[PDB]
Structure formats: structure tokens, C-alpha cells
Homo-oligomer: 25 residues x 4
């Protein structure tokens, strides 16, 4: 639904950002 989709997209973005920061370190 409109609430579970926005949540899922947010979690995906956060995971990608954390991975990128770990690569730069």
C-alpha cells in the first residue's frame, strides 16, 4: 500500500548510503 511502499523505498536508500560510506572508509 501507499504506506508500506514509501517505508520500503526509504530502507533501501538508507542501506545503499551505508554501503557507500563503508566503501569510502
Amino acid at each position: 500500500s501507499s504506506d508500506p511502499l514509501v517505508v520500503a523505498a526509504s530502507i533501501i536508500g538508507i542501506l545503499h548510503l551505508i554501503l557507500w560510506i563503508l566503501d569510502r572508509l
Copy 2:
């Protein structure tokens, strides 16, 4: 409006993150 713009930006960010994750895989 102030509600549709923040939603659109969020969807754009999520799509970009998904694409990046697919490239890394």
C-alpha cells in the same frame, strides 16, 4: 504543492538507489 513535491523527490531518490544496487550486484 508542498506535499506532491516532497513525494516526487522521495520516489526519484528510491529509484536511483535501486538502480545503483542493481549495478553493484
Copy 3:
């Protein structure tokens, strides 16, 4: 404040995502 900071960070992230998508195209 706690409301203007989260908004500013969100706009910054959206602009960065749009720029990245334009580079990939």
C-alpha cells in the same frame, strides 16, 4: 529547528539524485 533541518536534508538528497540520473542518461 528539527522540522527545517530534516526538510533541507531531504531537498539536498533529491537534488543529488536528479543530478546523478542526468549524468547516467
Copy 4:
């Protein structure tokens, strides 16, 4: 909790975006 985690992920994403923009400049 479900409120502190979403906030933390958001801050992490914003910091990563700012760093990327600084590198492009």
C-alpha cells in the same frame, strides 16, 4: 525503535549526499 531508526537512516543519507556534492564541486 521504529521512530529513531527511520530518523538515523535519514541523517545518514543526507550526510552521504552532502559529501558527494562536495566531491563534485
